[PDB]
Design an enzyme around this catalytic site. Sequence first.
Site, mmCIF file in Angstrom:
data_model
loop_
_atom_site.group_PDB
_atom_site.id
_atom_site.type_symbol
_atom_site.label_atom_id
_atom_site.label_comp_id
_atom_site.label_asym_id
_atom_site.label_seq_id
_atom_site.Cartn_x
_atom_site.Cartn_y
_atom_site.Cartn_z
ATOM 1 C CG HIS A 1 -8.564 -46.323 45.355
ATOM 2 N ND1 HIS A 1 -8.848 -46.154 44.017
ATOM 3 C CD2 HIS A 1 -9.025 -47.552 45.687
ATOM 4 C CE1 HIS A 1 -9.453 -47.238 43.559
ATOM 5 N NE2 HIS A 1 -9.574 -48.099 44.553
ATOM 6 C CB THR B 1 -0.109 -67.402 58.179
ATOM 7 O OG1 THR B 1 -1.472 -67.827 58.302
ATOM 8 C CG2 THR B 1 0.777 -68.616 57.970
ATOM 9 C CG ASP C 1 -10.396 -59.985 54.998
ATOM 10 O OD1 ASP C 1 -10.023 -58.868 55.394
ATOM 11 O OD2 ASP C 1 -9.633 -60.964 54.945
ATOM 12 C CG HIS C 2 -8.493 -57.211 52.069
ATOM 13 N ND1 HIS C 2 -7.713 -56.090 52.267
ATOM 14 C CD2 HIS C 2 -7.878 -58.221 52.734
ATOM 15 C CE1 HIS C 2 -6.671 -56.409 53.014
ATOM 16 N NE2 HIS C 2 -6.747 -57.696 53.307
ATOM 17 C CG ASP D 1 -7.925 -52.664 51.257
ATOM 18 O OD1 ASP D 1 -7.423 -51.522 51.164
ATOM 19 O OD2 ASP D 1 -7.250 -53.702 51.085
ATOM 20 C CD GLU E 1 4.366 -45.295 71.030
ATOM 21 O OE1 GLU E 1 4.721 -44.460 70.167
ATOM 22 O OE2 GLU E 1 3.952 -44.969 72.161
ATOM 23 C CD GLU F 1 -10.652 -43.335 44.639
ATOM 24 O OE1 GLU F 1 -9.618 -42.953 44.046
ATOM 25 O OE2 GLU F 1 -11.400 -44.244 44.198
HETATM 26 NA NA NA Z 1 1.245 -63.910 56.846
HETATM 27 ZN ZN LIG Z 2 -5.764 -58.779 54.916
HETATM 28 ZN ZN LIG Z 3 -10.039 -50.401 45.179
#
Ligand code: NA
Ligand SMILES: [Zn+2]
Ligand SMILES: [Zn+2]
Lengths: 285, 277
Positions: free
Chosen positions: A111, A212, A85-86, A107, A196, A115
């Site tokens: 940037h 969340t 993740d990320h 992720d 959309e 890039e």
């Molecule tokens: Na959240």
């Molecule tokens: Zn996230």
């Molecule tokens: Zn970065």
Amino acid sequence: MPLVSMKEMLNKALEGKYAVGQFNMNNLEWTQAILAAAEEEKSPVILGVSEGAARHMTGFKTVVAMVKALIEEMNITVPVAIHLDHGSSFEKCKEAIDAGFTSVMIDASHHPFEENVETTKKVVEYAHARNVSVEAELGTVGGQEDDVIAEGVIYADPAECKHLVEATGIDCLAPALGSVHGPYKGEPNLGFAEMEQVRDFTGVPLVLHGGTGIPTADIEKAISLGTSKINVNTENQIEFTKAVREVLNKDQEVYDPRKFIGPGRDAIKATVIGKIREFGSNGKA
Amino acid sequence: MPLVSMKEMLNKALEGKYAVGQFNMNNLEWTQAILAAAEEEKSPVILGVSEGAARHMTGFKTVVAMVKALIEEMNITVPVAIHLDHGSSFEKCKEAIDAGFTSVMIDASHHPFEENVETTKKVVEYAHARNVSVEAELGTVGGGVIYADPAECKHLVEATGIDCLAPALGSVHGPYKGEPNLGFAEMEQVRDFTGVPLVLHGGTGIPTADIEKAISLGTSKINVNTENQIEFTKAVREVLNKDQEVYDPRKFIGPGRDAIKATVIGKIREFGSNGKA
Ligand code: NA
Ligand SMILES: [Zn+2]
Ligand SMILES: [Zn+2]
Ligand code: NA
Ligand SMILES: [Zn+2]
Ligand SMILES: [Zn+2]
Ligand SMILES: [Zn+2]
Ligand SMILES: [Zn+2]
Ligand SMILES: [Zn+2]
Ligand SMILES: [Zn+2]
Ligand SMILES: [Zn+2]
Ligand SMILES: [Zn+2]
């Protein structure tokens, strides 16, 4: 049964107009909970691992070893992916992949666009050669940071979404459109009109971060507009800790960890089951 | 650098007149803390796994996978054993061994002597064929205490070939009602009659002087569990009580892990195995 990437499960989900939940892994009991929830609901599931969480669990190799052993010994039969993740960089994604991750998100949304495209294209080269799925991002997901405008949300640009997906060949895309990691200050303000358009012009499963606090109506709407993966993390922490507080407040003597961590793990399981059903992935394994 | 059995490390402790700590594993953070302590102290360590804790962690296979990966990824260089604590049956010891445990305890101390002997012998034959160390027990550890009989100890060690022996002589799992009343004279006899390293159960709450005295009487392995649970939970309580809002688990688990690490370090130093790796 072996681990799978997110490719098949997210495509099936997009065609079926439901979403697969990613639930972030934090430690051993967190993982048992998520997998138990996925197994009971007969749903595919994505185990999200931030670089921070991986460090908490020593590293990517411990994470992979532990998930694999759990799948075998809990007899998990449903599709499971392990998704970085990320991901900070090409080097982090490569490391997670070599360690045995089946999916990565690079992720580079903070940037400059060109890039982002270049980095992402490179991660995709390496991943697809190894049957690893890839997610990337445009726009900025909000957070709990100090002194930011609009919780730090910056909407993705649908035109850039089109270009990045075309140029890199990612399997899924997170167009940040009002998602905030952790609790929302008010009601989420999701850019459904923009979403959309991103759906129209990319044609790939979209990812909705900061699950969340996003009310059911927004979840259904997002799915109806191309979202096939939804991330939940904070909610599990909240429910885990609520259950841990309950036990520790009611019994001031207890020190046996499984007496408070167990109920916390159960709370997570019930939380994930609820989100699975809300996303529509129950029975979809 | 793979896991080892307990044989070499306990024989070194016996000759060196110090003890190796067994610290029970309860989860991922628990294991990281124990391994970090041992490595920092350059000390052998024994990771203890009860059958109940094994279940809490899904199973023996998950336990081994986790430990093997942590060992490699934390760069652990000191001797590490994984020891089935209070194995309840031959079959449980076999399962742990087959999953990759390097050491087992067949605890049949709550059965007639000849049954204990017979069961223990069966485990030893299976384990030793696979370079797995074996612990057995006579007498009963409190949870009610029953002193092991030194003659039975001699005979059981002779009939089975176990690598080490827990003569229950006042040990109590968890807090002691008063102060421990260990059977030091009994322990000396067992030491002399057997010639194998002895195991002291229920280390939590055994004062420094009793520990030093048990080691001088042939104790080479000392089990600690409860004190880690107390310190872990104490640290969790402090964080949750002072901050009614926090929900991020690392915010309280983290300091729990630190507390365990510090507790094990203290126990390793007290046992004398720092720098023996
Ligand atoms: Na959240
Ligand atoms: Zn996230
Ligand atoms: Zn970065
Ligand atoms: Na004790
Ligand atoms: Zn941490
Ligand atoms: Zn371009
Ligand atoms: Zn809630
Ligand atoms: Zn349990
Ligand atoms: Zn019997
Ligand atoms: Zn009894
Ligand atoms: Zn004497
Ligand atoms: Zn014991």
